[PDB]
Amino acid sequence: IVEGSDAEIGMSPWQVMLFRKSPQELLCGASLISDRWVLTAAHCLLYPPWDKNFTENDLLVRIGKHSRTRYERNIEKISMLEKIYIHPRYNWRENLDRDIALMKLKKPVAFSDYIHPVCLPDRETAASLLQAGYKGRVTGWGNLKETGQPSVLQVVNLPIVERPVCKDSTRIRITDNMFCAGYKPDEGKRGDACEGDSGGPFVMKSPFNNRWYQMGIVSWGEGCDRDGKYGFYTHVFRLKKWIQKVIDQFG
């Protein structure tokens, strides 16, 4: 995260770290949506242009973390993966359309002060809150700058951007399964996701019921925190039928 700040303890208890077993390293962010299911970006797991195609046994999920590099004894919980599910129409060839994946854990994780699921949006909460200017919150352990790395989880709040401005910022084809967020050059304030933040959540706190909802997944961008560029996020609500189908069938 560029131009964010250190998270408070327990600020993002749905935060998940995707951790490579060998070499031991950060692979991506992710989020906890129930005691057995973790949501992330498909490109965290499958991206053939970079020879990336992880299997279940390659990875662990680390839940309840705050420190990036420490083993947080008595706080974090480490889970193995039973199965990965990638959206069947994830477009890794072109523009990362439908950049979403689920991971089922081998055993349920115990909730605690540090470990708790985020809500997924209903249609009405999505319609109400996915508006230009409305801010969400992005969290992760990724790089602090495009060109270094944080001691603890970082957080930044960023406004959703009007779709024509998102489209006009890039040559990549934008779809209804994406939205963009970030400040405009004339707005002064800054901030973005960066390398290592992929797959983590863009959340909003509903003013109606005072619950946190995951509206987006960190998906893609061009550089990090560049003027006139915006971060792109997977539109979770638009892909919720697939999420529900997987959980109903395999949960």
């Binding site: 600020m11 801010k135 509903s206 005072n210 619950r211």
Partner: peptide
């Protein structure tokens, strides 16, 4: 889940985090 999105160290204790008000102020 029934209890989703309510953080043990914040909403469940009626404590506010340091920047959530920035989000609320944007929901205009």
């Amino acid at each position: 889940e029934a209890d989703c999105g309510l953080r043990p160290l914040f909403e469940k204790k009626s404590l506010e985090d340091k920047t959530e008000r920035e989000l609320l102020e944007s929901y205009i």
